Design an enzyme around this catalytic site. Structure first.
Site, PDB file in Angstrom:
ATOM      1  N   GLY A  94       0.960  -1.213   0.098  1.00  0.00           N
ATOM      2  CA  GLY A  94       0.107   0.023   0.163  1.00  0.00           C
ATOM      3  C   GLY A  94       0.877   1.302   0.142  1.00  0.00           C
ATOM      4  O   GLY A  94       0.255   2.280  -0.258  1.00  0.00           O
ATOM      5  N   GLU A  95       2.033   0.902   0.229  1.00  0.00           N
ATOM      6  CA  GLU A  95       2.981   2.257   0.423  1.00  0.00           C
ATOM      7  C   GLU A  95       3.249   2.809  -1.138  1.00  0.00           C
ATOM      8  O   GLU A  95       3.235   2.094  -2.204  1.00  0.00           O
ATOM      9  CB  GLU A  95       4.321   2.032   0.734  1.00  0.00           C
ATOM     10  N   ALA A  96       3.200   4.225  -1.161  1.00  0.00           N
ATOM     11  CA  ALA A  96       3.260   5.017  -2.479  1.00  0.00           C
ATOM     12  C   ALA A  96       4.682   4.703  -3.077  1.00  0.00           C
ATOM     13  O   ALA A  96       4.918   4.370  -4.235  1.00  0.00           O
ATOM     14  CB  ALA A  96       3.047   6.303  -2.504  1.00  0.00           C
ATOM     15  N   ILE A  99       4.729   0.975  -4.342  1.00  0.00           N
ATOM     16  CA  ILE A  99       4.158   0.907  -5.749  1.00  0.00           C
ATOM     17  C   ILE A  99       4.617   1.549  -7.139  1.00  0.00           C
ATOM     18  O   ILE A  99       4.910   1.071  -8.174  1.00  0.00           O
ATOM     19  CB  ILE A  99       2.667   1.341  -5.772  1.00  0.00           C
TER      20      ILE A  99
END
Lengths: 184, 321
Positions: A94-96, A99
């Site tokens: 879920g970390e930007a 990703i």
């Protein structure tokens, strides 16, 4: 007659699991190629955990995830199908930043496997964010407002060296998104 | 005041935690206030723009590109300013920021460094000052000397600067540095798809008239073609587009026509030299025979020419040959 319990170590402690796994069984060498080989080829390992481990900012982890992304092939394949294959090998975190690190190499691999699909490798990257956003939006009922085709095309205006992508390409991508949801 | 300065510092230090639609507005506001400051002449706002750029190196890449879509615009505005000191400060700080940027480990095939270095090209192509262009070249060459090994996908605009600096010295320094880069990092240049830009820069040095033109004439075709054991066709295209478009390079195009003596596409641009001195070019074109499908259009080209009297006198001889 062993090594069966070795998999479970990574499922909660990634670095510990790897650093214990290398000394026995598979993985002759600590090089990124071999660990990527085992990571893709071997199941029973948490997709979310391997996504977190590969997306980590460590240089060794980033090299390993280079190897993992390169190992899959997207040559002569549709962009949506290539993305589905890319997401069907691991669960992205879920970390930007994670990703971003994943999806950059996804776009680079897609370009180096399927050239001339887009003018620059920035275009598959931007399209990949757009399509993942549309996948999250369309197959979720948490919002009453509905995402339409014209708004999506307007959102994707001039993303190929400030030049619009073909409309039929985006229509096909939208239809593929509407067909089914990209699931882990 | 301790607390006030701490708060004003934390305002900018917190920029890395802003969302995209918020950091874009922050960037636009800082750009506007910086332009207001420059027009009247402090550069504190410019310093804060540089600090934010430092703080946002680690940001998500596409958000960073959107941020640069306005920061680079402001930097172009500052470079075109008529104050020498402010432009020099902006370019020096952009050089430092670029050395910081290059370590971002850009994957091959992308264009982030190419877009980030765009303000240098904009300043080169939009500033009327010898010393400003010299400063841009000096900072670019300091970049080459310091962090050349990490320059990936950033060679496009960074030869664009050289080929725009092909006009007047500036041209002497630019050609010397292009020669050094070509003779030291040719594998790197061809690796990142910068071959076309390198060829364009060299042939723009050649196409430029008013000694260096002769040197790059000898350094564009002869010393290049020996090194690679669209590399060849994309080489001969700029040779056509600039060599035949003074008299020395014009003829050297014709004497280099015969060096090599796929074919369909190469013929497509072969019409342009034909459709003066082009008589020698046409004689070389027939000499090129050193094949059947060529004969469908070569007689068409031969008869297209029928100044007029001598043209037809050449026509009869060339058809005979």
């Amino acid at each position: 007659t062993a090594m069966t319990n070795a998999i479970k170590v990574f499922n909660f402690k990634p670095k510990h699991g790897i650093k214990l796994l290398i000394k026995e069984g598979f993985i002759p060498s600590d090089k990124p190629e071999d660990i990527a080989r085992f990571l893709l080829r071997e199941e029973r390992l948490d997709k979310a955990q391997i996504g977190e481990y590969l997306g980590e900012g460590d240089q060794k982890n980033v090299d390993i995830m280079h190897a993992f992304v390169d190992m899959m092939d997207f040559s002569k394949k549709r962009f949506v199908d290539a993305l589905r294959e890319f997401l069907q090998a691991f669960r992205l975190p879920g970390e930007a930043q994670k990703i971003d690190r994943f999806m950059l190499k996804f776009a680079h691999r897609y370009v180096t496997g399927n050239p001339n699909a887009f003018a620059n490798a920035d275009t598959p990257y931007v399209l990949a964010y757009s399509v993942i956003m549309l996948n999250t939006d369309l197959h979720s009922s948490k919002v009453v407002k509905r995402m339409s085709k014209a708004e999506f095309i307007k959102n994707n205006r001039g993303i190929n060296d400030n030049a619009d992508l073909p409309d039929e390409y985006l229509i096909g991508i939208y239809d593929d998104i509407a067909s089914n949801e990209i699931v882990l | 005041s301790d607390e006030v300065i701490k708060s004003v510092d934390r305002i900018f230090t917190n920029t890395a935690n802003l969302s995209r639609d918020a950091i874009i507005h922050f960037a636009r506001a800082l750009t506007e206030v910086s332009w207001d400051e420059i027009k009247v002449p402090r550069t504190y706002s410019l310093q804060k723009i540089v600090e934010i750029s430092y703080y946002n190196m680690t940001r998500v890449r596409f958000e960073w590109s959107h941020i640069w879509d306005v920061l680079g615009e402001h930097f172009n505005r500052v470079g075109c300013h008529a104050n020498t000191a402010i432009v020099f400060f902006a370019l020096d700080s952009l050089r430092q920021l670029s050395m910081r940027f290059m370590e971002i480990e850009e994957l091959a095939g992308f264009k982030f460094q190419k877009d980030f270095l765009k303000p240098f090209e904009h300043v080169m192509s939009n500033s009327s000052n010898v010393t400003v262009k010299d400063m841009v070249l000096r900072c670019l060459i300091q970049m080459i000397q310091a962090r050349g090994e990490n320059i990936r996908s950033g060679w496009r605009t960074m030869f664009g600067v050289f080929t725009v600096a092909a006009r007047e010295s500036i041209v002497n320094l630019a050609y010397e540095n292009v020669t050094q880069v070509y003779k030291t990092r040719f594998g790197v240049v061809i690796s990142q798809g910068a071959f076309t830009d390198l060829i364009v820069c060299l042939t723009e040095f050649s196409k430029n008239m008013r000694l260096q033109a002769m040197e790059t004439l000898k350094s564009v075709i002869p010393t290049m073609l020996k090194t690679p054991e669209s590399v060849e066709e994309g080489f001969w295209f700029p040779v056509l587009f600039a060599f035949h478009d003074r008299s020395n390079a014009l003829n050297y195009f014709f004497e280099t026509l015969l060096r090599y003596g796929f074919w369909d596409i190469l013929w497509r641009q072969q019409l342009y030299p034909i459709f003066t001195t082009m008589i020698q070019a046409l004689r070389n074109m027939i000499t090129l025979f050193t094949e059947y499908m060529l004969d469908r259009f070569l007689e068409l080209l031969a008869l297209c020419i029928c100044i007029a009297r001598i043209g037809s006198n050449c026509l009869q001889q060339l058809i005979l040959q």
